[PDB]
Coordinates of C-alpha atoms in Angstrom, one line a residue:
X1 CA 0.0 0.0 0.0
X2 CA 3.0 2.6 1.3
X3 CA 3.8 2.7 -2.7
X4 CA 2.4 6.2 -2.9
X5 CA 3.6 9.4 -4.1
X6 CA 5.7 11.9 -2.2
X7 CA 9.0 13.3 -2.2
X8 CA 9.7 11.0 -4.9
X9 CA 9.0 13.8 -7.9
X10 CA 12.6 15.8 -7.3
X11 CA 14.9 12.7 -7.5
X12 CA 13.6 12.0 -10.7
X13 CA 11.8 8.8 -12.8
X14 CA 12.3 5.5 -10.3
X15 CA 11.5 3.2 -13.0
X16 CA 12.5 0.2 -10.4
X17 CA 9.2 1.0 -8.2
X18 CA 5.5 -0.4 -8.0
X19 CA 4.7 3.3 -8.5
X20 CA 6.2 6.4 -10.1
X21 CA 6.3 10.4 -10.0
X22 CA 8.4 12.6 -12.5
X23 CA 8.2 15.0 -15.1
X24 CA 8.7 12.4 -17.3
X25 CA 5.9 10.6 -15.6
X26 CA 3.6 11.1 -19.2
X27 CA 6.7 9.6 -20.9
X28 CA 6.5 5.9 -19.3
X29 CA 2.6 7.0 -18.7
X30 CA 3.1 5.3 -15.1
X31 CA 2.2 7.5 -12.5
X32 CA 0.2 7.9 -9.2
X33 CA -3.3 9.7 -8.4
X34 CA -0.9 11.4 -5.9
X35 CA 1.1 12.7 -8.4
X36 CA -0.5 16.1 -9.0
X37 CA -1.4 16.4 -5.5
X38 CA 2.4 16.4 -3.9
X39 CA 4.6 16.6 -7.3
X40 CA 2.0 20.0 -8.3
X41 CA 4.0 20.0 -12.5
X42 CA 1.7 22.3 -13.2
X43 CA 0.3 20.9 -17.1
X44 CA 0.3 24.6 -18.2
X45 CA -1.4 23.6 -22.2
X46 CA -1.8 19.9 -21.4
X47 CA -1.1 18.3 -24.5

């Protein structure tokens, strides 16, 4: 369960975990519903 996202949007993509936050989390298209919540990239024109 304790596979959710924190801190772990400043250390960069850890592609070796059950779940993921990064800038290039749209890249692998893997990551968490926490991700905008603690990460915040701010998806200025989306796509």
């Amino acid at each position: 369960d304790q596979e959710s996202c924190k801190g772990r949007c400043t250390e960069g993509f850890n592609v070796d975990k059950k779940c993921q936050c990064d800038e290039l989390c749209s890249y692998y298209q893997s990551c968490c519903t926490d991700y905008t919540a603690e990460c915040k990239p701010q998806v200025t024109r989306g796509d």
